[PDB]
Amino acid sequence: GDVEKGKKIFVQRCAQCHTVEKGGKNKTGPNLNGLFGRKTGQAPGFTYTDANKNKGITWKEETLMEYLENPKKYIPGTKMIFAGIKKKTEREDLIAYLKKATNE
């Protein structure tokens, strides 16, 4: 995916609720540092819904590709108010941004 493109998507569609850097604030949504390869509901210091907390999936290209298309359908009862990115390429660009930015 296009990292530079993904970042703009993130800046505009996610950044109001999420931080990416290590030690970043938990805001409306959880900090996303360390997201890849860890299970759902693991950001330290964030109060998740039960539905997010116990989803029991591991975050990575495949699982975010599905979730970000329609968050609530993948995790019914989530409190993330975000309708979903319908375009495949856009998700791909966002995911490559995330893989970089949540792991430095």
């Binding site: 505009q12 109001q16 108010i81 975000f82 309708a83 990115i85």
Partner: protein, 293 residues
């Protein structure tokens, strides 16, 4: 000599026709996701629906949604409507696809469609607005000013036959989109979830720390460290006692907000129009999701 506008349904057209129009709007809405830094077209369509209807003067029946007068330069160029050109452009290919639909029906339907596709309540809608000539275009200056207080808000909305609950409910559409300094001389969003219809406007108004600040156009707006804003007319809903009771109710009960909004916004989109007793009952359109599209 009172001005009457009798609804007249587009000949031979009924629920299924209007549902395709809805669907064509809804598919474009999903497709053109990039607009305005990924907010998409939903908010500007809702705004367009309101501003095309909000010219109504109940006292002489001038203005209103019926004539679809926004197609004329005078109204198109109203300073109060800057930014709405984008919604008109969005609807242009939809009007090319359905040259049988009236402009008023298209503008009003675009709003209904946008609210539903953003997961707002269902909003019943009636067809039969008929285009009127250029000389029926209301003069600029009928739409409300943002730099005002609760007394202005209440008296302004009386001209649209809206009471306290209707006003507070309708204002909750400010959950959507944002102010753009180049359009209105105000800058910033009311919340985080810019393109999902929720009661977030009421929850932010009550729960954020608002500080009164001058923006880059030298207008004053209420700002949160969170990066959200409230116009002076929005903040007015918590300075007024009777308004604030209703803000608290909606903040506590989204289902109630949705119900009251749905009614008020239909009523808004239908002000000034006489529907024959004959007329079909309001249409409630299916969302793309509900149709599996």
């Amino acid at each position: 000599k009172t001005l009457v506008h009798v609804a007249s349904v587009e000949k031979g057209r009924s629920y299924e026709d209007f549902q395709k129009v809805y669907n064509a709007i809804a598919l474009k809405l999903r497709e053109d996701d990039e607009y305005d830094n990924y907010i998409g077209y939903g908010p500007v369509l809702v705004r367009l629906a309101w501003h095309t209807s909000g010219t109504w003067d109940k006292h002489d029946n001038t203005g209103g949604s019926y004539g679809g007068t926004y197609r004329f330069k005078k109204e198109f160029n109203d300073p109060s409507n800057a930014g709405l050109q984008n919604g008109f452009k969005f609807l242009e290919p939809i009007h090319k696809e359905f040259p049988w639909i009236s402009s008023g029906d298209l503008f009003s339907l675009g709003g209904v469609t946008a609210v539903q596709e953003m997961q707002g309540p269902k909003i019943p809608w009636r067809a039969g607005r008929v285009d009127t000539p250029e000389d029926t275009t209301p003069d600029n200056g009928r739409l409300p000013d943002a730099d005002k207080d609760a007394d202005y808000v209440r008296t302004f909305f009386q001209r649209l036959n809206m009471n306290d609950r209707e006003v507070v409910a309708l204002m909750g559409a400010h959950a959507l989109g944002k102010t753009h300094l180049k359009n209105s001389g105000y800058e910033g969003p009311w919340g985080a979830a810019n393109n999902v219809f929720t009661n977030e406007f009421y929850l932010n108004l009550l729960n954020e720390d608002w500080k009164l600040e001058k923006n880059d156009a030298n207008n004053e707006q209420w700002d949160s460290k969170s990066g959200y804003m409230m116009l002076p007319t929005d903040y007015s809903l918590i300075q007024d006692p009777k308004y604030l009771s209703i803000v608290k109710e909606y903040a506590n009960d989204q289902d109630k907000f949705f119900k009251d909004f749905s009614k008020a916004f239909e009523k808004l989109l239908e002000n000034g129009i006489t529907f024959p007793k004959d007329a079909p009952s309001p249409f409630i359109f299916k969302t793309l999701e509900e149709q599996g599209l």
